[PDB]
Design a binder for this molecule. Structure first.
Ligand SMILES: *[C@@H]1O[C@H](CO)[C@@H](O[C@H]2O[C@H](CO)[C@@H](O)[C@H](O)[C@H]2NC(C)=O)[C@H](O)[C@H]1NC(C)=O
Ligand SMILES: *[C@@H]1O[C@H](CO)[C@@H](O)[C@H](O)[C@H]1NC(C)=O
Ligand SMILES: *[C@@H]1O[C@H](CO)[C@@H](O)[C@H](O)[C@H]1NC(C)=O
Ligand SMILES: *[C@@H]1O[C@H](CO)[C@@H](O)[C@H](O)[C@H]1NC(C)=O
Ligand SMILES: OC[C@H]1O[C@](O)(CO)[C@@H](O)[C@@H]1O
Length: 517
């Protein structure tokens, strides 16, 4: 398939055609990274919801596979859609679904029932009911058999929340080594609360705890996850819950986004650290401070120092109307997950996880240093649409802002600014003039995230630009900002801007990135 379209991310996953949302079923198994996803095999907006499937060996060069779980009744009257979920390798065959070949892979997902019906299990469901169901694969994920004899395996929200039957979703299941149990985290989405269950077999589930609400609650809670991450460089760890909400995303945005909490988990209960939860209902720990980082989910099958989350690189505010064809939506750059102590606080740090050396020029197309960069804007360089920028500079500069203007037309009336506000100690990303912003009024915005200089006073930014996106990794990765842009074909220029004064100790390098398709 030829993926050479305007706006087609060349180093982000998207399906060849049709609509995609949340990442699903993330599992590394026998050398392979599986990427499932919410998919419409019949259209370019949300509908007919199914699990698509793609694989890579390197989180970079993806190959699209056949549809894994195709909406039941697709092409006729649809009776069941496969909402979001997760996947594990049941290597010891606790489910019993293994035969005389491979052990089973097992998927746990939300069944959405668009019509009232009685299921093969003999259970009755109501119109718009959401329940938790399982399927299995004996061919390493290529094809899947749904567990029709008993699905759904978690039909109802826990009491006293039975009324929440339409909004009960997004199971993240994983093997908890310490308790030798399967654990699943689900979202009672309207209540801003998660429900945690255990199992010895993936079929029979017992409710063990509920978590939340805390922090951000200005939207329905979705896409919960729980993972053990390393802290700093020794042997300390902490558990982290990641969860989405829609709307009520990060300050400065309108729509969806992703928050987290740091704590401990004992196999049944997640206890948030005292400093991860904030009085009230507004302040939160944002995984990403930009508008287009949602439904972020973790990989099963990875070790402590190898953990990866993938996010949907879109926003429900306007996601249906991005000017893409014949696909809609991409995933963000996969995000390596760790914790670092920053300003005396265990803080999520992310790294851009692709095989960059396989696709990046070694020689920068642009590279400069300035002991003092003068106020104003430098000479223009041409970057193409796909590249990485490395910037560093002194926090003590007199400029009000320092930034790169990129994906810019030659006269820079079209541009996306990525920089730092010295007084506010914030990263900004201004896409107000970034190109096509016509399809939603909230799209043409300036976004912000906090970033304290390092110990030596240096602010560092790494910026990844692909055909319709910008991703900013600040400092060691403690602040990311992810933003779609839709620039015109000529918007391939860049320059540096020191506004209101000079910027000291500037270092700037830009490297070209090749296609992974
Ligand atoms: C769900 O999938 C169906 C196809 O099974 C889509 O179907 C109809 O609408 C399309 C318009 O783009 C046509 O291309 C299809 O031929 C037509 N066919 C059928 C079976 O109805 C439908 O639009 C999809 N739903 C959404 C919301 O995209
Ligand atoms: C598989 O069994 C072994 C031995 O009991 C154990 O180490 C492991 O935790 C089991 N479960 C999984 C999912 O690996
Ligand atoms: C800008 O760079 C171009 C290309 O190298 C060069 O021709 C031009 O002289 C530069 N302008 C200035 C003022 O240096
Ligand atoms: C900027 O360049 C574009 C052509 O790409 C043009 O449409 C526009 O008029 C120019 N703007 C100004 C202010 O010169
Ligand atoms: O596609 C439906 C799925 O999408 C999400 O709403 C979030 O983007 C999930 O909560 C749900 O499972």
């Amino acid at each position: 398939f030829n993926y050479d379209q305007p706006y087609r991310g060349q180093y982000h996953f998207s399906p060849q055609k049709n609509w995609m949302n949340d990442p699903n079923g993330l599992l590394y198994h026998n050398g392979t990274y599986h990427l499932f996803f919410q998919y419409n095999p019949g259209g370019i907006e949300w509908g007919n919801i199914s699990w698509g499937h793609a694989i890579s060996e390197d989180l970079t060069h993806w190959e699209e596979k056949p549809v894994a779980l195709l909406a039941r009744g697709f092409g006729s009257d649809v009776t069941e859609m496969y909402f979001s979920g997760s996947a594990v390798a049941d290597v010891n065959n606790t489910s019993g679904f293994g035969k005389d070949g491979k052990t089973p892979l097992v998927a746990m997902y939300t069944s959405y029932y668009p019509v009232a019906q009685t299921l093969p299990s003999g259970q009755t469901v109501q119109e718009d009911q959401q329940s938790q169901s399982i399927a299995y694969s004996l061919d390493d994920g290529l094809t899947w058999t749904t567990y029709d004899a008993a699905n759904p395996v978690i039909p109802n929200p826990p009491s006293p929340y039975e009324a929440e039957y339409q909004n009960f979703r997004d199971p993240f299941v994983f093997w908890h080594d310490e308790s030798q149990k399967w654990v699943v985290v689900t979202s009672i989405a309207e209540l801003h609360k998660l429900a945690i269950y255990t199992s010895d077999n993936l079929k029979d589930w017992k409710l063990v705890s509920e978590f939340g609400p805390y922090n951000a609650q200005g939207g329905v809670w979705e896409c919960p996850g729980l993972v053990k991450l390393p802290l700093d460089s020794g042997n300390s760890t902490k558990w982290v819950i990641t969860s989405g909400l829609n709307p009520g995303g990060p300050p400065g945005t309108v729509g969806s986004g992703t928050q987290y909490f740091v704590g401990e988990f004992d196999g049944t209960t997640f206890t948030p650290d005292a400093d991860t939860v904030y009085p009230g209902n507004s302040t939160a720990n944002w995984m990403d401070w930009g508008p287009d980082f949602y439904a972020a989910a973790g990989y099963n099958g990875l070790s402590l120092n190898d953990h990866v989350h993938i996010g949907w690189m879109n926003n429900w505010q306007y996601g249906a109307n991005i000017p893409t064809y014949p696909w809609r939506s991409a995933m963000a750059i996969p995000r390596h997950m760790a914790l670092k102590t920053i300003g005396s606080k265990a803080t999520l740090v992310q790294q851009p996880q692709e095989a960059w050396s396989s696709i990046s020029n070694k020689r920068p197309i642009y590279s400069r240093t300035f002991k003092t960069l003068s106020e104003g804007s430098t000479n223009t360089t041409t970057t193409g649409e796909t590249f990485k920028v490395d910037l560093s500079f002194s926090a003590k500069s007199k400029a009000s802002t320092f930034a790169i203007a990129l994906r810019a037309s030659a006269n820079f009336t079209e541009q996306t600014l990525v920089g730092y506000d010295f007084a506010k100690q914030q990263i900004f990303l201004d896409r107000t003039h970034s190109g096509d912003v016509s399809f939603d009024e909230t799209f043409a915005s300036v976004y912000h995230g906090p970033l304290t200089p390092d110990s030596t006073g240096v602010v560092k930014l790494s910026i990844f630009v692909d055909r319709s996106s910008v991703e900013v990794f600040g400092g060691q990765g403690e602040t990311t900002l992810t933003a779609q842009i839709f620039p015109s074909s000529d918007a391939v220029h860049a320059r540096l801007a020191s506004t209101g004064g000079t910027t000291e100790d500037v270092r700037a390098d830009i490297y070209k990135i090749a296609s992974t398709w």
